Design an enzyme around this catalytic site. Sequence first.
Site, PDB file in Angstrom:
ATOM      1  CG  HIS A  40      -0.476  -6.915   1.268  1.00 15.31           C
ATOM      2  ND1 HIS A  40       0.624  -6.946   2.092  1.00 15.31           N
ATOM      3  CD2 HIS A  40      -0.465  -5.689   0.703  1.00 15.31           C
ATOM      4  CE1 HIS A  40       1.244  -5.795   2.033  1.00 15.31           C
ATOM      5  NE2 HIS A  40       0.620  -4.992   1.177  1.00 15.31           N
ATOM      6  CD  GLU A  52      12.947  -0.033 -13.401  1.00 11.48           C
ATOM      7  OE1 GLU A  52      13.726   0.946 -13.526  1.00 11.48           O
ATOM      8  OE2 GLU A  52      11.940  -0.231 -14.160  1.00 11.48           O
ATOM      9  CB  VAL A  57      13.780   7.487 -16.656  1.00 15.20           C
ATOM     10  CG1 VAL A  57      14.765   7.670 -17.750  1.00 15.20           C
ATOM     11  CG2 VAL A  57      13.004   8.724 -16.283  1.00 15.20           C
ATOM     12  CG  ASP A  84       1.454  -9.999   3.642  1.00 14.32           C
ATOM     13  OD1 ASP A  84       1.112 -10.445   2.501  1.00 14.32           O
ATOM     14  OD2 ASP A  84       1.540  -8.769   3.906  1.00 14.32           O
ATOM     15  N   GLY A 175       3.067   1.411  -1.067  1.00 18.30           N
ATOM     16  CA  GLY A 175       3.874   1.223  -2.253  1.00 18.30           C
ATOM     17  C   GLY A 175       5.221   0.551  -2.005  1.00 18.30           C
ATOM     18  CB  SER A 177       3.198  -3.536   0.142  1.00 19.35           C
ATOM     19  OG  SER A 177       2.528  -2.943   1.221  1.00 19.35           O
ATOM     20  N   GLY A 178       5.709  -5.584   0.092  1.00 21.37           N
ATOM     21  CA  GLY A 178       6.333  -6.671  -0.609  1.00 21.37           C
ATOM     22  C   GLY A 178       7.838  -6.593  -0.707  1.00 21.37           C
TER      23      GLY A 178
END
Length: 223
Positions: A40, A52, A57, A84, A175, A177-178
């Site tokens: 999705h 990250e 930044v 999914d 946010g 998700s995945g």
Amino acid sequence: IVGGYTCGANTVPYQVSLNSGYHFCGGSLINSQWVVSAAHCYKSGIQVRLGEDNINVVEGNEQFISASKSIVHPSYNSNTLNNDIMLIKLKSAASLNSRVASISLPTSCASAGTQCLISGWGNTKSSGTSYPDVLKCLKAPILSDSSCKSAYPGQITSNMFCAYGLEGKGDSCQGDSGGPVVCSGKLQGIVSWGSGCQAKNKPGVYTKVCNYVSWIKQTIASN
Ligand SMILES: [Ca+2]
């Protein structure tokens, strides 16, 4: 992530951010060329961001690598969220180091009750909206399948599991998700869906990665 904690920079070195001009989803680095995310989360134009912590930044450990191809599971159903899962290939191999590292795929499915690590840059509020800059973490147990089915009647397939996650962490959120659900050092889940983030009686639902290892292996052997 609602009700979690600040992970600490690069302590989740397999966590990626998917960027299309902005962060929109997480993912998991499974080798130097491939990321596992949620189907999705598919869109064109993905840049994978590795290494990250603060996603707003440039801190000095990042690798930004465009995707060359994305492969959504052949049986993904966006209505039900069954299957999914998607694979994202990097245009160039990541440089693996202490801050950018792959996560192993499972050999066996995880057990009910096991405490897992869920992470991401999603919303940190159950009610309303606030997006963090640094990576957030949550320890959450896998729930029984009967508990999961009672929370979401008629909606939980054999390719999903639930993880308070009944009282309401009070979870993963928009946010996230995945992104990964890691249990005993293996990628066992993908942040998939739920009802809100109620974070009473609505835990998070996660793609059951152990069902997909054959598909992943065969796909990366031919692409
Ligand atoms: Ca950064």
